[model samples]
Target: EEASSTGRNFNVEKINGEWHTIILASDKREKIEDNGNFRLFLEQIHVLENSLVLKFHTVRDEECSELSMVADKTEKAGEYSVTYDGFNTFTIPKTDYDNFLMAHLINEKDGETFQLMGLYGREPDLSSDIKERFAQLCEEHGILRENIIDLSNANRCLQ
Candidate 1:
């Protein structure tokens, strides 16, 4: 589990490009539910010298809303710090660069903690194998299988 979550030999350059959010799982239901703060669709990833900029969109008031988040790189190869709904540690747990990637997030807010997992692909959809892998990863990270939400069926925000 640590092997996959640590993103060994992760190359920052290879991951800088367009991506689509396929699935999201969280320990807290509200975070990944409809209108949830973490229910976001990924569009692009801009890599910096030591940080990354993530662009995402979500429906707000029946309108597609854009959001940009800056994730500062940490000493670890794939770990980063971000400030959003709260202080978050974001990590790219697994990725093949050209096919699919899996991200894990730990957020701390007001004395509470939340765990989130996101599966992203180069395309708007992914295969069943990838979906199953995400489910296994979520389970390994303590997120229940029922908490996994498939976002691929939702209307995508125009790029």
Candidate 2:
């Protein structure tokens, strides 16, 4: 992917106030060309406090095919697993979910270029902590602070 000097590289949105899915990468060039790329957003997420239900928004043209992602492995005692009972879904432990987010956010690199297909996710706030985290993530990717905007509903979104 070509390196972009764009001030901001990514943004976050809290969908339905519960299912916080990361907005997929913009500039299609920066996105992974996989129907399963959406799966990444759903992978580490835990919703409903009981089960995680992921819906793949596939805009089809004509051809027919089923939409489902099978787990290469299963979680012991049904603690975490995914199924395709009319919806492409998966469920990992709450701790598993927490680890997933931290694993990605904590490792963000400053002054690093944002890979179009880079890891991305969104939470429910743009608070000071989140702003700092987002800025940290962007800066590592060489996205300047000036270019970033406060997209959250909160007035004091950006730190």
Candidate 3:
């Protein structure tokens, strides 16, 4: 039999005037720890009445990674920009895409730009534009590609 992945197991608390999130220890030997850096980090999370913005800072020559999500916004899910040096990024709506969380990442270097798509378990079979972008990304930066574990499979927390 499989165990249920649900049930209260995490807590968000404020420590040292900063917010922190920690997972409840399941065993006595397990030490409780905060995962704030990976979750929120040194970045300030600004929450407006109807929108939210996550501003982040680089440790050492890090890339520009910012996140903003809002309602009645553009076709894109949120407002974001990432840059290592110089790059052009454009995002389109995911309503018609296979997975709603998907987005295209465009990276530019040496007066050239490349676009790649974000995916979970499987790649989208639609959109020739996106398909072409993935093909190009594979041909260009295939060596840098990696397979990561998907977090969407986990159960959601009850409000």
Candidate 4:
């Protein structure tokens, strides 16, 4: 399946609000493993003129570390790029605008590339259907079922 964005129907304004990180999966097991740098909890998404700002927090050394990142918009809708732990190209492959969202990320670092998928919801708890869909999506992207981590009980720094 093609992991493209929602195209013209993607309303950025409708997606601006608080979101909770529900699940994360990666082709590389270590990226989503315990204490992994990619295991982040999303707090909010802010749409800008030509970019988007993401506020997130992650657990490090048993402490919550907050981070804000800017993702510059690209020519395609629902796609953006940012430089952080690596040069990341982020895409909102699927979203209902009111319930759940699925994001795909391609990161290049040190001559290596990795793929990560994130499931976010307006509420902390998501429906079984959504969760299943996310799992299927991950598998379609070459991520094994074991590589998927549910962070429902993880430490959330941003309330």
For all candidates in order, the CA lDDT equals: 0.87, 0.30, 0.29, 0.86
- Tens-place lDDT per residue, model 3, 37-111, is 122122233444333343433221233344332222233434334443444343422322122223344546687
TM-scores of all candidate predictions against the true structure: 0.92, 0.29, 0.27, 0.91
Candidate 1: C-alpha lDDT: 0.87
Model 4's TM-score against the true structure: 0.91
Q: By summed lDDT, which 10 consecutive residues of candidate 3 come out lowest?
A: 21-30
The best candidate in terms of lDDT:
1
lDDT of 2 at 139: 58
> Per-residue lDDT for 63-155 in model 2, tens only?
223333333223333222343322221212111122112211111124432232122234433246534654566556454555443323322
**Which parts of model 2 are misplaced by more than 4 Å?**
1-17, 21-123, 146-150, 154-159
Query: Which candidate leads the pack in TM-score?
Result: 1
Per-residue alpha-carbon lDDT of model 4 for 41-123, expressed as tens digits? Answer: 89899988888899998787667878899999877667899998888998998888788889999999989999999999999
Pairs that collide, model 3: none
The order of the candidates by TM-score, greatest first, is 1, 4, 2, 3
- Clashes found in each candidate (C-alpha, N, C closer than 3 A): 0, 7, 0, 0
Give the lDDT ranking, best first: 1, 4, 2, 3
The reply for model 4, stretches above 4 Å from the true place, is: 1-6, 156-159
Question: Hey, what RMSD does candidate 4 come out at?
Answer: 3.0
Predicted structure 2: lDDT: 0.30
Q: After superposing candidate 1, which stretches have Cα over 4 Å from the reference? A: 1-5, 156-159
Better of 1 and 4 by lDDT: 1
